[PDB]
């Protein structure tokens, strides 16, 4: 029975509004409604992994597994397993797997991350789950962020706690956040991102919703332009979107966008908005194709409408050879020639590097750079041909050119990192001196870029 080499991974988000839910909810996992849709002939195909993020989930943990696990082997007679489950407040996020999928499935975490102080601390934050599936290391993050319209440099500040605070995958990591820990990272939630028009312009943006008109809308949507200013996610994907805003909806019809000003809302408008978001971040040159984004129709005893995406995405097989694991494959290398790192920091302590992969038995520590000044006021910090050969645990090219090198420049004074990247040895050659090139973020933000030459020695 071999091992895949892609698999399909269903996300869903849905803020419940603290309602129970319908008796039927198949649509959202079928990915059938508005938007970016599931042809008909898949239905009976079971994704592999099902990643179910709810907010303002009024059910137990009990309650809306057994509604999952019932809503799935409806659809596709197969009995999932729960991976993990994770519940903060009313923020939840469950994990279900394929049963063949067990013995591939492991080093499972869990975590979750508070936002706010004091008045803003109680109830919106984040749950997350990592684990193993083979040889590629899975992030999942259900977030609820700030509500209100002029609350987005809130919702800002509440992703980059997340992104900080959130402990999951490979501790010895430490120098990374989760979004260099994973080879695919997918980031969901109530996001509470609004479009920003004028509040006298509501009947207008539902006039162009009911012609399903968007681009007028998306062009104020404040997630895309937050991200273009890269103020948000930055580095992070997201499919075009092409369903109707899925917030504010009057329950049990989705006929009627509630967006005036009641004591219930505390006075504020509720323009018809896409709070409801999928996101991911995968490593550089590893395939990832989202084959659905969109919203149901049918499910309507929320004030918001589920949405939900799906993924190809590429996986690996847990590698054994004659050598590695347990020693090192000498002939295989990794060379880094005429490296330098742009670092936007006034600093001018000394630098090195650290270069971490599951394809090396421990992190690499390099030598101090060379600290030179840049012609437009930036740090250069030259490594030049003095970083430390690397040796890789296998040295087959199938395995080798699959893997990835997550790179960190730290404070020789501190210790602290001031930059994270990841370089891809998905090589259009080997033996061969090829470019390389990271940008390089600290708390999800850019700091600076690593660039240079490598050289991959594989056993072909
Ligand atoms: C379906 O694949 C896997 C693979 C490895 C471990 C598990 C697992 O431990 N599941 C579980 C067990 C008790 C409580 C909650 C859970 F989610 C599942």
């Known amino acids: 029975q071999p091992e895949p080499d892609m698999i399909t991974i269903f996300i869903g988000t849905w803020n419940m509004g603290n309602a129970p839910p319908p008796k039927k909810i198949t649509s959202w996992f079928l990915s059938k409604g508005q938007g970016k849709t ?11 992994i099902y990643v179910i993020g709810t907010q303002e989930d009024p059910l137990s943990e009990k309650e809306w597994l057994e509604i999952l696990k019932h809503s799935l082997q409806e659809i596709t007679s197969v009995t999932f397993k729960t991976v993990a489950i994770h519940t903060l407040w009313n923020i939840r ?9 067990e013995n591939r499935i492991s080093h499972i975490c869990t975590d979750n991350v508070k936002t706010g102080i004091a008045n803003t601390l109680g109830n919106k ?24 319209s002029e609350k987005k440099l809130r919702r800002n500040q509440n992703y980059m706690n997340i992104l900080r605070f959130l402990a999951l995958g490979d ?68 499919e075009e979107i092409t369903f109707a805003p899925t917030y504010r909806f009057e329950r049990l019809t989705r006929d009627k966008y509630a967006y005036t000003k009641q004591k219930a809302t505390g006075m ?3 323009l018809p908005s896409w709070c409801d978001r999928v996101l991911w971040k995968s490593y550089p040159l590893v395939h990832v194709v989202c084959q659905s984004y969109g919203s149901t129709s049918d499910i309507m005893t929320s004030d918001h409408s589920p949405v939900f995406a799906t993924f190809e995405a590429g996986v690996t097989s847990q590698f054994v050879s004659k050598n590695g694991p347990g020693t090192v494959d000498s002939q295989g290398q990794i060379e880094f020639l005429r490296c330098y790192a742009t670092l936007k920091t006034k600093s001018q302590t000394k630098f090195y590097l650290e ?58 004074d501190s210790d602290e990192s001031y930059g994270e990247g990841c370089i891809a040895l998905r090589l259009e050659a080997t033996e061969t001196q090829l470019p390389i090139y990271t940008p390089l973020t600290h708390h999800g933000e850019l700091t600076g870029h690593f660039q240079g030459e490598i050289k991959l020695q594989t056993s072909q």
């Open 93 to 101: 996020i469950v994990v279900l797997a394929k049963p063949e999928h």
């Open 355 to 412: 270069f971490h992969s599951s394809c090396l038995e421990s992190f690499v520590k390099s030598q101090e750079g060379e600290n030179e000044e840049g012609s437009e006021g930036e740090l250069v910090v030259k490594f030049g041909e003095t970083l430390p050969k690397l040796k890789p645990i296998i040295s087959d090219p199938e395995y080798l050119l699959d893997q990835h090198i997550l790179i960190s420049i730290k404070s020789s």
């Open 125 to 148: 934050g984040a749950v997350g789950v990592s684990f193993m599936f083979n040889g590629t290391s899975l992030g999942f993050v259900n977030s609820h962020l700030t509500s209100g």
């Open 268 to 270: 504020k408008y509720n």
């Open 38 to 48: 599931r042809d008909d002939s898949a239905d009976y195909i079971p994704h592999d």
């Open 171 to 238: 501790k010895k990591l430490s120098p990374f956040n989760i979004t260099h820990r994973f080879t695919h990272l997918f980031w969901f939630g109530d996001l509470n991102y609004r479009v920003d028009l004028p509040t006298w312009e509501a009947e207008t943006i539902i006039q162009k919703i009911k012609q399903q008109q968007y681009a007028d809308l998306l062009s104020h949507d404040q997630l895309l332009t937050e991200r273009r200013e890269q103020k948000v996610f930055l580095h992070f994907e997201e």
